[PDB]
Amino acid sequence: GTSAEVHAKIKLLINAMVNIWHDWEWTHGIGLYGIWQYYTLTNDAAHLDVIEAWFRDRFAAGGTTKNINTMAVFLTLACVYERTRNPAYLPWLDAWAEWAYHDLARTRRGGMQHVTYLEENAGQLWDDTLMMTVLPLAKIGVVLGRPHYVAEAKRQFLLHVQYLGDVKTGLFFHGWQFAEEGPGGHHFATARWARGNSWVTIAVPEFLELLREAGMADEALEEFLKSTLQAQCEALRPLQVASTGLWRTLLDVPEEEGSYQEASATAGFAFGVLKGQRKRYLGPEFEDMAVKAVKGVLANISEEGELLTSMPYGQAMAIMALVEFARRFI
Amino acid sequence: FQGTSAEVHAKIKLLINAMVNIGWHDWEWTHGIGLYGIWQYYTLTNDAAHLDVIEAWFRDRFAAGGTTKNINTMAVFLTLACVYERTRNPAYLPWLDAWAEWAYHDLARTRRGGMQHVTYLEENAGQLWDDTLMMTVLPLAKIGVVLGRPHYVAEAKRQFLLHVQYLGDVKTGLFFHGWQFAEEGPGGHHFATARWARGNSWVTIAVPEFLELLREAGMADEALEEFLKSTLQAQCEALRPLQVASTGLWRTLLDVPEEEGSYQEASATAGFAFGVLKGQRKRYLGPEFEDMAVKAVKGVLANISEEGELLSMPYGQAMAIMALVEFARRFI
Secondary structure: OOHHHHHHHHHHHHHHHHOOOOOOOHHHHHHHHHHHHHHHHHOOHHHHHHHHHHHHHHHHOOOOOOOOOHHHHHHHHHHHHHHHOOHHHHHHHHHHHHHHHHHOOEOHHHOEOOOOOOOOOOOEEEOOHHHHHHHHHHHHHHHOOOHHHHHHHHHHHHHHHHHHEEOOOOEEOOEEEEOOOOOOEEEOOOOOEHHHHHHHHHHHHHHHHHHHHHOOOOHHHHHHHHHHHHHHHHHHHHHOOOOOOOEEOEOOOOHHHOOOEEHHHHHHHHHHHHHHHHOOOOOHHHHHHHHHHHHHHHHHOOOOOOOOOOHHHHHHHHHHHHHHHHHHHO | OOOOHHHHHHHHHHHHHHHHOOOOOOOOOOHHHHHHHHHHHHHHHOOHHHHHHHHHHHHHHHHOOOOOOOOOHHHHHHHHHHHHHHHOOHHHHHHHHHHHHHHHHHOOEOHHHOEOOOOOOOOOOOEEEOOHHHHHHHHHHHHHHHOOOHHHHHHHHHHHHHHHHHHEEOOOOEEOOEEEEOOOOOOEEEOOOOOEHHHHHHHHHHHHHHHHHHHHHOOOOHHHHHHHHHHHHHHHHHHHHHOOOOOOOEEOEOOOOHHHOOOEEHHHHHHHHHHHHHHHHOOOOOHHHHHHHHHHHHHHHHOOOOOOOOOOHHHHHHHHHHHHHHHHHHHO
């Protein structure tokens, strides 16, 4: 595999994903972000146009209701605003960040409750929150010059590591449920999902970079989150399927119990591990693991530009992985 | 309160004189909180005699050549840094420098960069204990403040995050005593459960002291403070139903009945009492734990003999001193 081939796969994925896409869910958050990351790499105006056209059309349709998932797209919007300074985005950045900071339901200990469209999910913390709401909030705090947003995001990272982290394995539980009354609580099913864990593998390097670039980095926090990411990668290493480079949907569950290989979540891991190494949050010891994962993703991408349950999720993760992989050829 | 400020002060002085006139002329894992308890009383009442005891202790040990550096002997330098901050005694500078440099650079590190609980007799490879926060982390942090070495403080913040991560038990809100990193591969295991009163009280003491240390030094972090506050809050909520309502004491194994050999322990109760009282006073906690904390103090008072002993003995006296001194803060 060469540079030209990788880029061709990226464009195949992007074209297939956007010419599929005309809704607003959490998949659009990572979908737009993958396209944005490719734009920061190659500076192709067509990719920026795709992003700007998406927001232009949704905003014209009155936008959407606010929850943990719909918040995801505003990580990209904040990134775009940082470059274009488009004043049209300002009331959107302001309104949704103010909601996430002030109005979004809080669990015990001040954790961001995983409120969805259908479900209130009282007292629940999920893994994807870090990617879906916390990082959008942090980035808006940077671009609008509102440091308290960023402080709150740091807090949420500490809270989610605390209440989802599993130091015995180095992996993460999917969800935490605070007790209705009294102290403590319980994790949902004490399950270590590939997709859920991948959100941490993605969010941590993205968050560490965001802070450093904004001049808002804290050394203790960076060292802590670095060791946390390191611990997860060490756990991922023997769990990877050596023959394919993919991980199983239930990471620590063997295939004889029904835990099938999952290319989409593998792509998510691939991005985080590659980026973690590039930004030097990790050493080079996971490079072979990450390259194997990339090869596994490439082998599971169809000629239609599809993986495989969520198809735009798979395409989004594959885009993020291959774009970050393409960064190695500069 | 069916008692007086004056009686509490009398009990404090009873404990101090009992602990000091005792041994006291050794250098062990108890002298850290022993000296600190005396220091905290000095900051309250400004009696030169109490500062005299502290400075005499350091003077005699330093003249005797000090001791070897481990996670426990480091404890006394929390007080030394606190004393230096006020008196600016240059005689303390090489000691503060040498021991902080050891803690920062030389002290053995576990995986994830955690401070290994190295003691006088054992290396304890790959082990993190609860008391490390008070024994070494707080000394390092305070020296970083008084010497103007911010990287010490950053490391201290890092250690607090690591120990909450690897000793915290979110299911109960309590803390495990110890953690073992696997020799090879990811993960590991906790040892001596998350039910020890003494062990948990070390965390209840360390968190308010650390938060206050940072704020007074102008090195406080909002996210960190909110995080450690909620963590302390979570532990206090766990302790509330576990307290013996009639005596105000906690059992040595917090969730284990006396019927099964878990007796009430005044020493650890004194530890909890200090942390909860100071947590409220500094507003890290709300007033909701006031009844719990006051009943704990009354339990400690009721278990102080006329010879100023509880029922380690100096450990008990040291904890009781810290508890009653902080309780005395409420009367001014």
